[PDB]
């Protein structure tokens, strides 16, 4: 359920989205990064094929925000360009993923952070959200 209270939810967390991806869809992840975090990930997957359409992977040790896709059982070429690394240990964060026609747009704490051109093209097959790593998850919502 969108708006379910995830305060005590163990990582990894996995959820079927009620409405899958498509133009106009929005998913928000609210949580806190552990003060002793090394990394975490938020993935959007196609539940049947288990392809990962969008892999979002903040790595705290090197301050890199890694994005990739796992298609046909292989990781693609990573995207790492950032204006700034928008996470910090111990911080509350809000990450918003908006699905546009040609790309995802991802915002952190209310500020646009990056675009990710769709590699997995069949958007409405993207029906699953998985989250894992060194965070306290508070809530996920989608609309």
């Amino acid at each position: 359920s969108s708006g379910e209270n995830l305060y005590f939810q163990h990582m990894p967390f996995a959820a079927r989205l009620n409405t899958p991806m498509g133009p106009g869809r929005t998913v928000v992840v609210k949580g806190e990064v552990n003060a002793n975090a090394k990394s975490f990930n938020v993935d959007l997957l196609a539940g049947k094929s288990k392809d990962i359409a969008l892999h979002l992977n903040p790595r705290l040790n090197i301050k890199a925000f890694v994005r990739n896709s796992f298609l046909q059982e292989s990781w693609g070429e990573e995207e790492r360009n950032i204006t700034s690394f928008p996470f910090s240990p111990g911080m509350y964060f809000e990450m918003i993923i908006y699905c546009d026609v040609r790309e995802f747009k991802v915002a952190v704490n209310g500020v646009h952070s990056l675009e990710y051109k769709h590699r997995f093209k069949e958007l409405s097959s993207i029906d699953t959200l998985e989250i894992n790593g060194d965070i306290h998850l508070l809530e996920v919502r989608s609309w």
Partner: peptide, 11 residues
């Protein structure tokens, strides 16, 4: 209300 402390730049 989506309960966004930082707002939504895509709205």
């Amino acid at each position: 209300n989506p309960g966004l402390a930082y707002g939504n730049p895509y709205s």
